[PDB]
Amino acid sequence: RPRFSFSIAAREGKARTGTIEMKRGVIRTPAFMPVGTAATVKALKPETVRATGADIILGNTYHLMLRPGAERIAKLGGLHSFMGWDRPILTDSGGYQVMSLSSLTKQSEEGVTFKSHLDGSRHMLSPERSIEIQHLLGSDIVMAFDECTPYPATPSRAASSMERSMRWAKRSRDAFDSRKEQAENAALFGIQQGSVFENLRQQSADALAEIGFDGYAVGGLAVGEGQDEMFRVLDFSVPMLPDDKPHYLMGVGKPDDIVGAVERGIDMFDCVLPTRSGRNGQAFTWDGPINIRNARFSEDLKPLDSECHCAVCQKWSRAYIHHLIRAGEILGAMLMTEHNIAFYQQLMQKIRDSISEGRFSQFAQDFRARYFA
């Protein structure tokens, strides 16, 4: 099997569909990655994650380096063996989560020193340490160590932040290439920064393309800017990236965010929304989200969604799941999560099929008209 081979089978406008072939499996694009921060997709066995249609999951350098530890996972055989998922795993590099979750941080050209949110102990991240951690975990897609610029930012602060990220991108490339086993078996993605500014996004794309990566993420979005502004930035930013490599929009998003981002050339997505909001009682349907705890569902015998093919919708009613979530029962979290991840995967499948068949424009219009009715 290839280390990493991306093939575009069809296009419609800026939208693309195809496959990434890797040693541990094929990734169909556009792809949605369920989030598995602490070496588990919350409330699902890996076999259930696979049954929903997921080809790849996301893990986190920041969380795993703190608990259970990167060296410990490596001693136990790597992340895949540890959690029982034998297909591709992409790991974020720590650059975003350290600044989001740490109580205290010190930032410099070398990297970031920080206090753990679990117990206050002191730790360090850098391009070299992030790549090493991802090696110890056995990631298949390694993310460069970057800085996610806060929003809003002045042009000059966005520029200096982006420039640091580009120096860190080169250090990430070099650290990855030095580790022969990692360079032979994994892939490395760079992360574009530049906040909402077209000229900075161009400078960042140029720097990443000069280094060369297997894929290119659009970083620095889903940080409070809202959909209109995110789409405006995507309109000019995605065309700056190499066309022949995958484009990954980090942390996005709601179903309509995904559809619009695909219309703008994005191939890969991750988001906690289906898992987290599932546990909180929000179920996705083709007619929009529903709050299953609402009293209107107490005697509703219909499945969560009338068309969904998932195992939850084949077997259990809204009324039962309403009861489980209101009672705080673990099975409620399990069933809501499986349905929401299955729904996300069915959305990605309809996106892939409609692009391949040259009817994605109509799909997006029909999707929105019904979802927002």
Ligand X SMILES: CO[C@@H]1O[C@H](CNc2nc3cc4c(=O)[nH]c(N)nc4cc3[nH]2)[C@@H](O)[C@H]1O
* Site residues for its own copies per CB under 8 A: 38-40, 42-45, 67-68, 72, 75-77, 82-84, 298-299, 301, 315-317, 319-320, 323-324, 326-327, 329-331, 333-334
Catalytic residue among 55, 92, 140, 305: 92
With CB under 6 A as the contact rule, the residue among 88, 138, 215, 220 that binds ligand X is 220
Within 13 Å of residue 146, how many CA atoms lie on the same side as its CB? 29
With CB under 5 A as the contact rule, the residue among 179, 276, 293, 309 that binds Cl ion is 276
Q: Which residue has the tokens 């929401």?
A: 340
Taking CA atoms, 311 is separated from 240, 305, 345, in Å, by: 41, 12, 13
Nearest 10 degrees: Cα torsion 31, 4, 206, 99: 60
Give the shortest CB-276-to-Cl ion separation in angstroms: 4
With CB under 6 A as the contact rule, the residue among 29, 93, 134, 161 that binds ligand X is 93
In this complex, which beta carbon is closest to ligand X, that of residue 51 or of residue 272? 272
**Is residue 55 among the annotated active site residues?**
no
In this complex, which beta carbon is closest to ligand X, that of residue 191 or of residue 335? 191
Stretch that binds ligand X, among 68-76, 217-225, 304-312, 313-321 (CB under 6 A): 217-225
Within 13 Å of residue 161, how many CA atoms lie on the same side as its CB? 26
Q: How far apart are CA 317 and CA 302, in angstroms?
A: 5
**Is residue 270 among the annotated active site residues?**
yes
Residue nearest to Cl ion (CB): 275
Catalytic residue among 214, 257, 270, 305: 270
In this complex, which beta carbon is closest to ligand X, that of residue 50 or of residue 232? 232
In this complex, which beta carbon is closest to ligand X, that of residue 136 or of residue 218? 218
Longest dimension (CA), the chain: 61
E strand intervals along the chain: 4-12, 15-22, 25-29, 31-33, 57-60, 89-92, 105-107, 112-115, 122-125, 141-143, 187-192, 215-218, 247-249, 268-270, 282-283, 290-291
Supply 213's token pair. 């990566």
In this complex, which beta carbon is closest to Cl ion, that of residue 209 or of residue 272? 272
CA angle 345, 347, 350 (to 5 degrees): 110
Does 281 sit behind a cis peptide bond, omega within 30 degrees of 0 on the bond before it?
Answer: no
Q: Which residue has the tokens 């619009």?
A: 260
Give the shortest CB-254-to-ligand X separation in angstroms: 9
Report the catalytic residues.
92, 270
Q: Footprint of ligand X on this chain (CB under 6 A)? A: 92-93, 95-96, 143, 146, 148, 191, 219-220, 222-223, 250-251, 272-273
Chain residues in the site for Cl ion (CB under 5 A): 42, 272, 275-276
Q: Which residues are annotated as a binding site?
A: 92-96, 146, 193, 220, 308, 310, 313, 339
